[PDB]
Write a protein that binds this ligand. Structure first.
Ligand SMILES: CCc1c(C(=O)O)c(S(N)(=O)=O)c(CC)n1C
Ligand SMILES: [Zn+2]
Ligand SMILES: [Zn+2]
Ligand SMILES: [Zn+2]
Length: 232
């Protein structure tokens, strides 16, 4: 097992995993509701700077993330994008802001984070409010596939590396029942996944919000799990 598993990462530690040239995932863990879960984000080299996708789920993990990036990569994180309003995506935004990172999210994500009492990224990403909308953000494309895991969920594509960061709209294969669906749109989630398939059919690596990467098979896997949950 080369990809770090929830079992191998102690409290408040962060692993990096090089997926491709100038693309890493970051992996952290927290206790939640009596179980330990892993959580993924992304790091994309942006010349001699780094673009961060998502916090490492809380302030302590996010401080450890910045220290791991300095140790293993040693280039400054200048911008971060949060892919939805939940604490595994925005928890630690204030740590990033204090370290001089420009934090970004859609106005949808910023609105929902403020309602929830979660940390609010400073900068707004325009042009992502309609299903199927894509915008460039330096070395990535940001895509709003429609409501799925959350109404605001974004996916991130790294064209140089054919890496699709699905975030929490995409489940790892080992997840065969629904995760947190309190904020989900079950009715639209499969339609939103099909938009991802149609936009990024060339993707070679697919990174879920939680757990092990795979290929585009994770999209069909997630549709299967969401449909089974719908039919509960
Ligand atoms: C069950 C895995 C999970 C999810 C999920 O299904 O994505 C989230 S989230 N992004 O807040 O919904 C969390 C954080 C509490 N956890 C532990
Ligand atoms: Zn979430
Ligand atoms: Zn700024
Ligand atoms: Zn999540």
């Amino acid at each position: 097992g080369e990809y770090p598993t929830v079992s191998e990462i102690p409290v408040g530690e962060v692993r990096l995993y090089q997926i491709a040239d100038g693309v890493w995932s970051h992996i952290a863990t927290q206790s939640f509701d009596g179980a330990v879960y892993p959580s993924n984000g992304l790091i994309v080299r942006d010349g001699d700077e780094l673009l961060l996708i998502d916090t490492a789920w809380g302030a302590k993990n996010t401080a450890a993330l910045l220290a791991e990036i300095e140790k293993q990569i040693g280039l400054p994180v200048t911008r971060a994008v949060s892919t939805h309003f939940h604490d595994d995506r925005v928890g630690g935004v204030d740590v990033l802001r204090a370290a001089g990172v420009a934090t970004y999210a859609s106005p949808s994500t910023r609105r929902l984070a403020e309602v929830e009492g979660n940390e609010i990224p400073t900068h707004s990403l325009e042009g992502l409010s309609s299903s199927g909308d894509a915008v460039r953000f330096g070395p990535v494309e940001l895509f709003y596939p429609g409501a799925a895991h959350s109404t605001d969920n974004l996916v991130v594509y790294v064209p140089s590396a054919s890496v699709l960061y699905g975030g929490c709209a995409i489940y790892e294969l080992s997840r065969t029942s629904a995760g947190n669906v309190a904020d989900a749109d079950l009715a639209e989630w499969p339609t939103s996944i099909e938009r991802i398939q149609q936009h990024y059919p060339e993707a070679q690596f697919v990174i879920p919000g939680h757990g092990l990467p795979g290929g585009l098979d994770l999209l069909k896997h997630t549709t299967n799990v969401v449909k089974a949950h719908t039919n509960r």
